Amino acid sequence: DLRLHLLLNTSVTCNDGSPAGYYLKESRGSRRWLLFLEGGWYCFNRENCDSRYDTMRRLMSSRDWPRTRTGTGILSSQPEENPYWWNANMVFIPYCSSDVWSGASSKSEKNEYAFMGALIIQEVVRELLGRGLSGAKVLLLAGSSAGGTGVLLNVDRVAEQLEKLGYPAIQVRGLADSGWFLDNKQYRHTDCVDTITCAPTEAIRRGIRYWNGVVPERCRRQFQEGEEWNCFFGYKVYPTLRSPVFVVQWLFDEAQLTVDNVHLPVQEGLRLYIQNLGRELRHTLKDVPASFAPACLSHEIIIRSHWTDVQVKGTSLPRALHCWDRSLHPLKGCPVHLVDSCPWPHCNPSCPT
Numbered sequence: 402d403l404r405l406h407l408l409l410n411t412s413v414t415c416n417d418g419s420p421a422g423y424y425l426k427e428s429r430g431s432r433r434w435l436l437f438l439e440g441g442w443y444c445f446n447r448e449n450c451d452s453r454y455d456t457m458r459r460l461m462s463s464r465d466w467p468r469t470r471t472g473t474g475i476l477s478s479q480p481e482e483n484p485y486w487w488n489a490n491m492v493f494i495p496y497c498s499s500d501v502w503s504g505a506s507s508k509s510e511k512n513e514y515a516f517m518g519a520l521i522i523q524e525v526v527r528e529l530l531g532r533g534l535s536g537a538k539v540l541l542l543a544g545s546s547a548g549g550t551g552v553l554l555n556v557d558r559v560a561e562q563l564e565k566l567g568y569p570a571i572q573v574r575g576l577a578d579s580g581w582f583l584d585n586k587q588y589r590h591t592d593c594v595d596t597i598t599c600a601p602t603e604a605i606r607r608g609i610r611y612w613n614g615v616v617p618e619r620c621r622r623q624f625q626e627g628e629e630w631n632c633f634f635g636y637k638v639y640p641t642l643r644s645p646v647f648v649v650q651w652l653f654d655e656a657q658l659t660v661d662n663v664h665l666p667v668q669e670g671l672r673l674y675i676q677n678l679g680r681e682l683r684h685t686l687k688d689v690p691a692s693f694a695p696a697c698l699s700h701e702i703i704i705r706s707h708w709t710d711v712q713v714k715g716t717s718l719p720r721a722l723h724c725w726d727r728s729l730h731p732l733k734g735c736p737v738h739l740v741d742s743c744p745w746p747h748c749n750p751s752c753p754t
């Protein structure tokens with residue numbers, strides 16, 4: 402299990418002012434640290450953040466958090482379930498800021514909620530240094546869904562922060578799972594009048610000004626003021642990053658199809674859209690040298706119990722991540738770029754059922 406630790410700096414809080422925290426399994430005999438970022442959508446105005454506080458309060462408050470948690474998938478400590486990093490120090494950071502890990506605004510008398518996702522990550526890193534992280538050699542920042550996007554938004558921040566604090570020997574890397582979205586044309590169109598009819602391109606623009614959200618500096622200087630929402634999209638923010646990032650993304654992500662207003666007898670018009678979405682996602686990963694993109698209709702992977710089962714062209718995800726490890730020291734029989742080529746959901750037989 403991983404034990405809960407509330408942040409000693411109580412000014413860094415969840416949405417409702419309660420302090421944030423992290424769960425930790427520690428491993429003396431290892432200098433490897435896995436920091437996982439939870440996902441769970443977002444909220445971008447007063448009224449849908451109020452609805453989130455009624456039925457998704459654990460994603461906005463820590464007052465009801467459990468006392469331990471069990472690592473699963475890549476966070477497991479059993480080699481049978483986690484052939485990749487079973488012996489590493491494990492950290493699980495609950496997602497309680499609803500800002501795609503981008504906010505930097507406290508609760509005050511102008512703000513009903515606090516959005517401090519970007520600062521939650523700083524404070525966890527700073528407080529973990531005094532518990533072993535100072536002697537680490539690799540800090541892998543991972544996350545799923547909204548946590549996957551938060552990896553891309555924060556991976557260079559964690560590197561830069563450890564450089565100014567006097568720890569230049571720590572190698573910061575990122576693993577973004579199911580956070581590689583496309584701002585594409587929709588299957589049916591609705592203009593942003595409320596929460597259900599507001600596309601992510603436009604909800605995130607409102608979110609940034611509501612959250613006071615931050616983006617990677619070098620991406621900000623490209624799109625400049627008013628256009629920071631572009632940096633929330635994988636193929637646009639990835640080229641500006643310096644830290645090595647491994648990208649995992651289903652070719653037909655269910656969250657991508659949801660925001661595209663697709664709900665699965667498919668006829669022609671829809672057949673082309675689904676096929677065009679798969680080819681478009683492969684085009685964006687063409688220059689991503691460390692990637693893993695099966696042709697399945699699913700969502701999330703790296704922390705599910707059976708994350709070892711999916712294979713792309715004979716290679717499982719934990720093997721590709723191990724091949725990634727060696728490349729950071731083309732390897733014979735140990736590939737890192739694994740993107741399916743068949744063009745319909747479940748054309749790969751190892752897809753999750």
Ligand SMILES: *[C@@H]1O[C@H](CO)[C@@H](O)[C@H](O)[C@H]1NC(C)=O
Nearest residue numbers: 409410411412413520523524
């Ligand atoms: C707590 O965190 C805030 C925001 O990062 C910072 O301004 C403040 O100095 C911190 N306090 C301590 C005691 O570290």
Ligand SMILES: CC(=O)Nc1cccc2nonc12
Nearest residue numbers: 442546547550582601633660
């Ligand atoms: C759950 C989550 O974080 N979703 C998203 C983040 C960034 C861009 C997106 N485009 O569609 N969905 C997006």
